[PDB]
């Protein structure tokens, strides 16, 4: 029988500064134990400051970001060259999402961007459109192998204060854009060794009031 | 009805200067169901210590068997047995159950006693020996685990030092498993000393 | 089916079949309503050119649309009997859906809203 | 939902500095391994286009209709159809893509893989592939089936990454793809010798090549085989 | 982990905080209480997206009556607008256990349980999820009807921190909310990893924890 | 959703329903009521798949409600009855049908007699002296057929209910958290507030 | 990955050293090449206890029959007993391996699937890399390969397996049997996949870590 | 694909070199004409493993015959095929054609196709999974042909087989059993394709 | 056989044990002791398959009665509980494993300390405060959590059960027909008469 | 068995008579060369229904073609034969070869297998479950054969598909398409047997 799904791999991550938001994707695309693309973007500058990627199923995949790309398109047409902010475009996602309840697309979405305070905004969502914003958010095969880590050097979970008997937490504080490039860049070098599906290469989106720069990282290529 | 996945739990070992530690959580649940919260998955026989993963019961019944066959290993050798030598032992007692084996993850560690070499070995629950320089890694948050270690981890650190990282890299992993915490011990070993600390983390 | 546009306006801007339908109520037997301090009393004329009348059978003026609402009329008979259809239907439909009786402002802007419908739908008067 | 009964198998294609390259063998295949021959996977579209099609070849002679249909639309009322509004390879491509894609949400899916190879009007080399899923990507070296797994692997060996591209010559292309045809086909229970090779470049436009056979194959060492093991005889 | 009580002092609302897909733990940080308006909670078990989808659309539909009636709707009418919605799409897969909370002058403070098989409640005390056992526990061995406001909030927040210890699928943090006539109140977000403690030395409870 | 009980008096017909509401392993609600007024003098109680009994009860509700106002007439227990089982008999060739039984329960002000009418999910309705649905009728048919008369009294009805009831306690494996009892007589509906 | 090519005084077998749970990397670094006998090695592929188990049990019986015939070891016993034992268990034993080595006899290369068929020939590959393997294989092998033309068309096909097969990766381990000649074993004979320095050192403060209890383990009599 | 043909002055046994898993050709130039003794050869069809296993006791049984008895005729050799593969037929995939040279008998050809059954015949061919044809251009057959004949008749057989069946191809290979030995024939594709 | 609960106090063990047996849709018995004494100061309770308890139950009482005899000694709850595991251990990889679980409570006369074990069908033993078979310890273990002392008396861990057992009546489906309640101390095993 | 050869003077259309239910023969003396316009002919493989169902509608467009655009290519009624075939793919299963004589174009061989696909071809064979069969003797068929030598071609191929399979037997019928008309030929067992 057809089978109207499939897995191309891939993982992401997506990180929210002070003044600032991160989005990251590595650049392979597989099926099964072949790699399809060595580079085939999966982050994409949606306008209006809203970084996007849906990583799992590449078909619905692309669907949905040039669905979500055609919305933000109509908002400005309807509604005078409104800037779409980072919530209202998360709540239309449910929606987009959420239409397709009873034949999923499957992927998971992160989408980074500023709120109207200027702050750094993450959005995750699940394949039906549940949806949470988020200071730190992993996405796709190697999600369960970087998650933890951001839990321990971005949140400084389960990290206490040296001498205070455990009593006293590490206090929590906003990291720096080179700081937090840092931690993408090992969270994938990590990834792409002990999992197959990451790797080749690593391509991060940085949101800023001044707009949306890209920096590219070589990754392992086995 | 998946044996590995219905008590849940994990260990970890991992490499330093000199030195090796070893770790478990605490948690003995069937399926959603938090049981025990006093579980310990690691057990030394003389110097060599062994931590087990998987289907509790193969967990117990694989511990009374590995005592069982050191036993009468020191008796007839009349030496403690080595973690190189212990690992085969374990890697021979799995496949001898291939068509019908015991649901387990086990891990060893220790140091020669005659090189001072530190000595760390994983297995699959069909005995396949996983032997690494840095780290081992076992249970149903293996995944989690993986990606701690492949971050925290560097060569050569002093036990004082490698108990932060081997600590933060169990508590991170299980605190993203449902299956896993309930508390936590470390063990320490050195040489001629082994220091075993619980840790404090959330009971949830 | 049958489309035509049979309320539409004029010049002088009116709607004539609204307007005529108005004289159709003025033709229609005389209905008064007068509310008291702690009730209310609907009072219905009944035209005399009508003996040898059966009073237990032929259609009472004053309708129950619920148990604590009531409906008088004046103008086409027929007419009244699908707009106290309707709203008796509706009754049930509120008290299944909101576990409440109606209000009686709402079940007037009910009825009031099918006969505004009926105003400029296609192939309707 | 369907089941796939004649197929076509593996399409492989490589960018080289001044275009293109694709190539298909001419063989159409059973159940049981039967073949068949005389099936032309290649699918020219104006004069910058080469659409290579494998799987159902029920499905891939309707998508042959779809593109005549498409060439034939696209001149209508259009004065430029043979200039500046000619079709190009990403609109021919993102066509296919689009039709893919509903196909398979439609639960009834053209059961192919398809990689689109030409030359943009900016002269930029387009390569991309689509599949029964609607699954899309672009690489320098694109193939399809068992081609993915024997004759990438020697492709990539000439274009790596992009930087290699501008390096590699259309001799030398050539070359790798002839040579990791006859690779196929001494591994493929599903190819033939006789297969169709397309070159499109910027310069020279497109060549079209029927009737190719493979040639220069080993064979010699197989009278030194004896027996599975033991057999000395 | 979800549970609403009535008792003298209005209602008592409290939460986990915890997602999982399978054996991994998506979330520790999710909202499980819709605000919906201020007189009106919704709490949210089973899928994710259903309940929260659902609960936010329940938040326009009761806006909706109120433009239209110039009332705020019953807890009645706005439990049975989602209840006769999942009713609609039952058989199809939706997974939803939900509680309706709020206070009218009408009805007084008000709880409905509604699920996703049709099943509409009118109750004093419900618990729903997979820890609602471990909550049940708690609550109907120390629940009087003439519980304190300070009381019934610790008793809320007890019960859920019970359920968060016992049960894998529950955790992450307790969310309390106080419903009264003036309206819903916050009372906080509390970290099941310091309050689990906090507890512990404070109550004498947890025995059974390494101490 | 699980034990509807009805015995026909000689002026009056008594409907026992289970008070426990159980999803999963746990018992969410011991006072519920499994019974909807059709009319001032026909009751009807219910059981089956969750959300469907409460469905088919109170649309059943709101369209003997509309006959009412549209006629100022109650309808018979009879003519509700066969309403009903026209209902149901659709409902089992529908796409997702009902899955209710009920018992109707009611007193004919024009014969001036009581009538209990059980009716299954098939809409398989039946007249009868005493009824019950699901596994009930395993332990109280056989009671019934002992010790019930024609010529009860409505406290008669009411002691050879509480021996039904006790019967059930005792050889039933679930809590049913004791019945709801209501009576149907000349003078409408009531319930009995001990029991 | 693995491999086998024939030279003109000997044979060479290659592997890749990357083992896989589902699409976990459970060691980036471990040895699927065996020695049976000193001259006889064996690449394995497949379940990874089965193969050492296989590979250790026959090179027991063989360094057993080799003191008791008081001759060096056969290729051709130890392929014989390999096959024998692997179709005993219908496929169950997921052993797939490529037998090389030199004896008396000369140099010799064969191939073992699971069910206990075996292939001869001058080239061949086994594994998720072999169709990646065989294709730089079906290129490149000539007859009369000299040993240094062996050993890079061996690692080659490794090579090929690592970079396209994401069953395959790290490191390449080459074992050269020479007639006349000790085999010799090249562990990590190629190393291209060295992890780059980390950007950041994740060493944490001393006493991170909250701890509610420490005892000193007693491991002496 | 695979045959064996009865001619003056022996028998010759004629196959494919392909090994097929799925559609991957495993090995391109298999050996699939064996040798159970000196003038007793068989053909190889059906699961590689089977073959080889049946094939190496068949050796054994022969070797031992040959050790007590002396010689053994092709119909013996026949017999222990069969025996192997009718006993063992419910676990067994393996397709066989046994020929062999006595100086009394001359060439003789038998066939064990998948139930375990043994056939005598002038030649025989199977093709596909263990296919065996009656008749396959029976005229194109004589008795007696002459060895270039014979060659010439199975490389013509086998290079139709591999044109039109994907699990055949590569060499044909063929081996002719005479009074005179044991002779080793292949053709490459660019011989045989050209027919 | 369903609700098996066990608290260890300060000076004793309690086990608490339903006393319905319900085969189908009929509870047959509503005074069954799902308990054997092991030793004078070991008692066993269980619940899970129908004859599997009973029959692995007394296996185990004429295991230990007769070490008791041979050795003229009393095993240790640690030893009993050690010995219960390995048979329950034996059984999950038999053609027909035991589907039984058990709490052994035992008074250990050598440490002057009572002691609880709990032993599911698999053989996972585990020592604990307080312990459940099945869904009782959904219910149970929060209750146990929030009121549990180490230090408590005998009197007050009987207090503490009734508030176990009343939550089990209130929140459980079925009707268990309450529980037979055992005291295990220094002075051995007696049964609470009234509960 | 059914095939399709182009010739000299035009094109010959062959097929056998067997109409098989399992192994019992439904009908003996089946006509499978079936008319969709005077000088376009078919052969039918697959279901009887489902071919029956496609020639008669495939006849039907080709009368409705005439009456409005006159005599219609082979090509044409080959595309019509497709579109019902590829539209249809999923409930039918039909395997068709389309043979057709224009005074511009001569004979023209065109075959709709089981994809639904069209291969426009010199000839044709398809046998067994419509298997087509590539090459078949390609060195026994030549272009412009004479009308004698591609009845010879024809008869022997289909009697050795005959020989080998059981779905094909009975008498082989044939239809000859040229300028000069439309010939029936039919050839016994007796005669092509002996072949
Ligand atoms: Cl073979
Ligand atoms: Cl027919
Ligand atoms: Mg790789």
């Known amino acids: 029988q057809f089978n109207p799904y499939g897995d191309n791999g891939g993982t992401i991550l997506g990180i929210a500064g002070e003044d600032f938001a991160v989005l990251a994707g590595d650049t392979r695309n597989i099926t099964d134990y072949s790699i399809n693309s060595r580079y085939e973007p999966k982050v994409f500058d949606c306008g209006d400051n809203i970084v996007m990627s849906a990583n799992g199923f590449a078909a619905d995949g692309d669907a949905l970001v040039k669905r979500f790309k055609n919305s933000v398109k109509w908002y400005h047409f309807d509604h005078n060259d409104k800037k779409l902010s980072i919530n209202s475009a998360a709540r239309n996602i449910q929606h987009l999402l959420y239409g397709k309840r009873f034949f999923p697309y499957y992927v998971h979405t992160i989408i980074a961007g500023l709120d109207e305070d200027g702050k750094g905004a993450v959005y995750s969502f699940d394949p039906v459109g549940s949806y949470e914003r988020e200071q730190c958010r992993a996405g796709g095969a190697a999600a369960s192998l970087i998650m933890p880590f951001l839990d321990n050097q971005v949140n400084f979970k389960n990290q206490y204060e040296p001498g205070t008997n455990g009593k006293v937490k590490k206090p929590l504080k906003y990291l720096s854009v080179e700081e937090v490039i840092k931690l993408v860049r090992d969270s994938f070098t990590s990834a792409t060794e002990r999992h197959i599906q990451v790797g080749d290469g690593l391509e991060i989106l940085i949101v800023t009031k001044d707009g949306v720069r890209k920096e590219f990282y070589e990754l392992k290529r086995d | 009805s998946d044996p590995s996945s219905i008590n849940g739990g994990i260990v970890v070992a991992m490499t330093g200067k000199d030195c090796v530690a070893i770790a478990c959580d605490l948690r003995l649940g069937s399926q959603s169901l938090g049981v025990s919260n006093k579980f310990e998955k690691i057990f030394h026989y003389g110097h060599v210590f062994l931590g087990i993963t998987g289907l509790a019961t193969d967990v117990t019944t694989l511990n009374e068997m590995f005592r069982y066959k050191t036993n009468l290993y020191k008796l007839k050798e009349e030496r403690a047995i080595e973690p190189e030598t212990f690992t085969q032992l374990v890697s021979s007692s799995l496949y001898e159950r291939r068509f019908g084996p015991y649901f387990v993850g086990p891990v060893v560690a220790g140091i020669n006693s005659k090189s001072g070499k530190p000595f760390i070995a994983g297995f699959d629950l069909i005995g396949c020996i996983d032997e690494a320089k840095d780290f081992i890694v076992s249970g149903t948050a293996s995944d989690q685990l993986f990606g701690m270690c492949e971050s925290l981890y560097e060569p050569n650190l002093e036990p004082e030092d490698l108990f932060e990282t081997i600590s933060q890299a169990l508590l991170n992993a299980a605190d993203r498993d449902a299956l896993s915490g309930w508390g936590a011990v470390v063990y320490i070993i050195k040489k001629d000393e082994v220091v075993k600390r619980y840790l404090k983390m959330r009971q949830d | 089916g049958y489309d035509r546009a049979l309320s539409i306006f004029s010049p002088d801007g009116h709607i004539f079949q609204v307007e005529y339908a108005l004289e159709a109520v003025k033709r229609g037997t005389c209905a008064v309503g007068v509310k008291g301090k702690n009730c209310v009393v609907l009072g219905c004329e009944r035209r005399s050119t009508l003996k040898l009348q059966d009073t237990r059978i032929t259609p009472s003026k004053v309708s129950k649309i619920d148990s604590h609402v009531v409906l008088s009329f004046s103008g086409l008979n027929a007419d009244s009997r699908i707009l106290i259809e309707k709203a008796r239907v509706e009754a049930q439909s509120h008290r299944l859906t909101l576990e409440d009786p109606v209000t009686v402002e709402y079940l007037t802007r009910y009825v009031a809203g099918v006969q505004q419908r009926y105003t400029q739908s296609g192939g309707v008067r | ?233 | 982990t979800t549970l609403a009580f009535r008792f003298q002092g209005g209602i008592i609302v409290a939460v986990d905080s915890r997602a999982t897909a399978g054996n991994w733990v998506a979330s520790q940080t999710v909202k499980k209480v819709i605000e919906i308006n201020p007189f009106l909670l919704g709490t949210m078990a089973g899928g994710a997206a259903d309940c929260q989808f659902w609960e936010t659309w329940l938040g326009s539909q009761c806006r909706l009556h109120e433009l239209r009636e110039k009332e705020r709707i019953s807890v009645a009418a706005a439990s049975k607008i989602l209840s006769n919605l999942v009713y609609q799409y039952k058989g199809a897969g939706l997974s939803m256990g939900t509680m309706i909370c709020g206070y009218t002058r009408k009805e007084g403070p008000t709880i409905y349980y509604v699920d996703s098989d049709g099943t509409r409640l009118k109750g004093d005390i419900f618990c729903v999820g997979s820890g609602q056992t471990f909550a049940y526990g708690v609550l109907d061995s120390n629940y009087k009807w003439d519980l304190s406001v300070e009381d019934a909030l610790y008793l809320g927040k007890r019960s859920i921190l019970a359920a968060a210890h016992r049960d894998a699928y529950s955790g992450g943090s307790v969310n309390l909310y106080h419903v009264t006539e003036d309206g819903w109140i916050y009372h906080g977000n509390h970290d099941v990893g310091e309050l689990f403690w906090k507890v512990k030395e404070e109550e004498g409870s947890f025995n059974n924890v390494i101490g | 959703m699980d034990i509807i009980l009805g015995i026909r008096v000689q002026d009056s017909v008594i409907l026992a329903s289970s008070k426990a509401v159980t999803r999963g392993i746990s018992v969410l609600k011991d006072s519920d009521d499994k019974t909807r007024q059709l009319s001032p003098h026909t009751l009807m109680s219910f059981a089956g798949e969750a959300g469907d009994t409460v469905q088919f009860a109170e649309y059943i509700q709101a369209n003997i409600q509309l006959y009412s106002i549209r006629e100022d007439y109650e309808l018979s227990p009879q003519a509700v009855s066969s309403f009903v089982r026209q209902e149901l008999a659709k409902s089992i060739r529908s796409r997702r049908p009902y899955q209710v039984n009920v018992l109707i329960g009611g007193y004919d002000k024009k014969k001036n007699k009581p009538e209990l009418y059980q009716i299954d999910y098939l809409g398989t309705k039946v007249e009868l002296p005493y009824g019950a649905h699901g596994y009930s009728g395993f332990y109280t048919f056989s009671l019934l057929d002992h010790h019930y008369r024609p010529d009860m009294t409505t406290e008669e009805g009411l002691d050879l209910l509480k021996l039904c009831v006790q019967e059930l306690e005792k050889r039933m494996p679930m809590d049913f958290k004791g019945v709801i009892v209501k009576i149907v007589d000349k003078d409408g509906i009531r319930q009995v507030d001990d029991f | 990955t693995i491999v086998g090519v024939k030279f003109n005084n000997g044979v060479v077998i290659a592997a890749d050293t990357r083992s896989t749970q589902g699409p976990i990397v459970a060691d980036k670094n471990c040895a699927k090449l065996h020695r049976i006998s000193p001259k006889i090695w064996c690449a394995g592929a497949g379940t990874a206890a089965d193969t050492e188990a296989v590979t250790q049990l026959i090179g027991s019986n063989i360094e057993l029959h080799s003191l008791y015939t008081s001759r060096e070891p056969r290729v051709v016993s130890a392929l014989q007993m390999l096959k024998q034992h692997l179709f005993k268990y219908q496929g169950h034993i997921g052993a797939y391996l490529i037998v090389a080595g030199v004896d008396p006899t000369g140099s010799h290369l064969f191939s073992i699937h699971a069910h206990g068929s075996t292939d001869v020939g001058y080239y061949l590959s086994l594994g998720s890399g072999s169709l990646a393997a065989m294709a730089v294989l079906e290129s490149h092998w000539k007859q009369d390969l000299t040993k240094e033309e062996a050993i890079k068309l061996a690692s080659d096909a490794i090579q090929a397996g690592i970079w396209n097969d994401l069953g395959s990766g790290s490191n390449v381990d080459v074992c050269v049997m020479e007639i006349g000649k000790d085999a010799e074993y090249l562990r990590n004979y190629l190393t291209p996949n060295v992890r780059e320095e980390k950007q950041k050192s994740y060493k944490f403060p001393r006493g991170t870590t909250a701890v509610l209890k420490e005892s000193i383990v007693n491991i002496c009599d | 694909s695979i045959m064996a043909v009865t001619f003056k002055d022996g028998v010759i046994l004629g196959a494919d070199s392909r090994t097929t898993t799925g559609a991957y050709i495993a090995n391109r130039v298999t050996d699939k004409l064996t040798r159970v003794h000196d003038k007793i050869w068989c053909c190889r069809s059906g699961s590689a493993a089977d073959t080889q296993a049946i094939a190496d006791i068949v050796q054994y049984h022969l070797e031992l015959y040959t050790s007590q008895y002396g010689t053994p005729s092709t119909e013996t050799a026949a017999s222990v095929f069969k025996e192997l593969c009718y006993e063992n037929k419910d676990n067994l995939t393996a397709g066989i054609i046994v020929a062999g040279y006595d100086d009394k008998n001359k060439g003789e050809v038998y066939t064990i196709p998948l139930g375990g059954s043994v056939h005598k015949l002038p030649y025989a061919i199977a093709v596909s999974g263990s296919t065996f044809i009656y008749g396959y251009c029976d005229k194109n057959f004589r008795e007696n042909m002459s060895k270039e004949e014979t060659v010439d008749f199975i490389k013509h057989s086998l290079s139709q087989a591999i044109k039109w069946d994907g699990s055949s191809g590569g060499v044909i290979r063929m081996v002719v059993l005479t009074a005179a030995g044991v002779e080793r024939l292949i053709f490459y594709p660019d011989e045989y394709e050209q027919l």
């Open chain 4, 1 to 233: 939902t369907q089941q796939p009964i004649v197929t076509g198998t593996s399409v492989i294609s490589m960018k080289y500095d001044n275009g293109v390259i694709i190539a298909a063998d001419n063989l159409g295949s059973y159940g049981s391994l039967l073949r068949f021959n005389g099936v032309e996977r290649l699918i020219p579209v104006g004069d910058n286009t080469v659409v290579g099609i494998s799987g159902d070849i029920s499905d891939m002679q309707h998508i042959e209709r779809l593109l005549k249909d498409l060439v034939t639309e696209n001149a209508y009322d259009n004065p430029l159809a043979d200039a500046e509004e000619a079709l190009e390879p990403s609109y021919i491509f993102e066509y296919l893509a689009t039709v893919m894609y509903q196909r398979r949400s439609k639960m009834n899916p053209l059961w192919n893989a398809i990689i689109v190879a030409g030359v943009q009007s900016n002269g930029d080399q387009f390569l991309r592939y689509v599949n029964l899923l609607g699954v899309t990507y672009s690489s320098p070296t694109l193939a399809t089936g068992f081609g993915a797994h024997m004759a990438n692997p020697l492709l990539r060996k000439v274009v790596d990454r992009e930087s290699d591209i501008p390096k590699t010559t259309v001799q030398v292309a050539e070359e790798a793809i002839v040579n990791a045809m006859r690779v196929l086909y001494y591994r493929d229970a599903r190819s033939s010798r006789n297969f169709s090779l397309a070159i499109i470049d910027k310069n020279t436009g497109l060549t079209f090549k029927k009737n190719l056979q493979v040639e220069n194959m080993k064979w010699d060492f197989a009278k030194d085989i004896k027996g599975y093991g033991t057999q000395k005889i």
